[PDB]
Design a protein around this ligand. Structure first.
Ligand SMILES: Nc1nc2c(ncn2[C@@H]2O[C@H](COP(=O)(O)OP(=O)(O)OP(=O)(O)O)[C@@H](O)[C@H]2O)c(=O)[nH]1
Ligand SMILES: [Mg+2]
Ligand SMILES: [Zn+2]
Length: 390
């Protein structure tokens, strides 16, 4: 039962390894191009612009590797006040990481990410201080288009955080474009948490219309929470479920048009975050239907993990994969140009045996480097076949 999130972890490892190799190769290639261009006994075998191109690639490949090394999956939770957003997050983390109450903050966000340490802490904006998580409920938020508070929870205690997932908790939806710009541009999945004792509201729909306008084919899940409230009323529950399904299906399929009606079955769930957290927190007869609701939450979790791991690998690693392929194609063109100029010179105007031998060594080293580029192209093609479907 391997978590689907390992797909993202393995992709991240693979592409960072390629970019480590690419920086090493381009550095070696740049030294060769530089030596060839700067040789006073050679004329226009390598050009000044060949060297400028190689040096420019060299100078930007380290930051690509560093950016890749921090890439992660992000899920953002939205919904009306008291719908259960924080409890859904806590259930997925197997602990009461986030508190309840304090629902008055109208514009500030909270994220949870993994720490390699063994103690939880938080950090506020523009600060490096590791503050006790028990101060979450005391942060003033006076002046605040709000702020982000970052919670760090030991990776050893939650597999999701170990596998590079970050979870974002939001204020109640009841300028929004500022929310999208500041928190949503790199979110891979959006989760709408709704009170199943109510009805899906237009204020929540409106926010996801804005997301859908700003982003292409966003991944959206709807969790109809507090489903324990109709336990022991199975006939009533059946009818409420039908009504919720009709409205949630129409929203995802007909209004947002982000899934077809079959796909939507894997995006709408009926759960009790309270029950799930109680079952998972370490250290009375269960309500009717408890195990069925727990299984439904576990089904959501599996489908969510599959969705976010596939989506984030494409969203976050494809552009630099395509860029690496372009860089390699250009480096090969430079090696082709150097080899061709050396061979032309050898056959057109080279005279002394020592000059001929010098040109032949330039040819040989340019081919060694070109073959290295081809091998890295093969690694990127393998990465594309494994991790980047059309
Ligand atoms: N019966 C029941 N209560 C729940 C469930 N999920 C959350 N609650 C309760 O509803 C209240 C609100 O829970 P939260 O998880 O804090 O909801 P929220 O959306 O984060 O609320 P705010 O951040 O204050 O807007 C808490 O008292 C929870 O115990 C559930 O599945 N079933
Ligand atoms: Mg909350
Ligand atoms: Zn704030």
């Amino acid at each position: 039962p391997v978590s689907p999130l390992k797909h993202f972890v393995l992709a991240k490892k693979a592409i960072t390894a390629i970019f480590d190799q690419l920086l090493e190769f381009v550095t070696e290639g740049s030294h060769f191009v530089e030596a060839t261009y700067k040789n006073p006994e050679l004329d226009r075998i390598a050009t000044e612009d060949d060297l400028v191109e190689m040096q420019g690639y060299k100078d930007k490949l380290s930051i690509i590797g560093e950016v890749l090394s921090r890439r992660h999956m992000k899920v953002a939770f939205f919904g009306r006040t008291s719908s259960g957003k924080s409890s859904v997050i806590n259930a997925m983390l197997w602990d009461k990481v986030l508190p309840s109450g304090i629902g008055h903050i109208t514009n500030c966000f909270l994220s949870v990410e993994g720490t390699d340490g063994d103690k939880a802490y938080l950090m506020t904006e523009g600060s490096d201080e590791k503050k006790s998580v028990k101060t979450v409920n005391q942060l003033a938020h006076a002046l605040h288009a709000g702020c982000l508070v970052r919670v760090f929870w030991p990776k050893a205690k939650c597999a999701l955080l170990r596998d590079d997932l970050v979870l974002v908790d939001s204020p109640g939806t009841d300028e929004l474009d500022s929310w999208i710009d500041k928190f949503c541009l790199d979110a891979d999945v959006f989760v709408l948490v709704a009170n199943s004792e109510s009805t899906l509201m237009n204020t929540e729909k409106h926010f996801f219309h804005k997301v859908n306008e700003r982003l292409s084919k966003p991944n959206i899940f709807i969790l109809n929470n507090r489903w324990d409230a109709s336990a022991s009323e199975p006939e009533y529950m059946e009818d409420v479920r039908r009504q919720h399904m009709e409205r949630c299906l129409h929203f995802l399929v007909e209004e947002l048009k982000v899934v077809n009606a079959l796909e939507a079955q894997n995006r709408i769930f009926f759960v009790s975050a309270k029950e799930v957290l109680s079952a998972r927190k370490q250290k009375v007869a269960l309500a009717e239907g408890f195990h069925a609701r727990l299984q439904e939450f576990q089904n959501f979790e599996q489908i969510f993990e599959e969705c976010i791991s596939q989506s984030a690998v494409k969203t976050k690693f494809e552009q630099h994969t395509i860029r690496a392929k372009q860089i390699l194609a250009t480096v090969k063109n430079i090696m082709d140009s150097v080899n061709l100029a050396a061979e032309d010179k050898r056959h057109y105007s080279a005279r002394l045996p020592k000059e001929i031998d010098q040109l032949e060594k330039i040819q040989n080293n340019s081919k060694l480097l070109r073959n290295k580029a081809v091998q890295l192209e093969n690694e990127l093609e393998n990465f594309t076949k494994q991790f980047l479907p059309s």
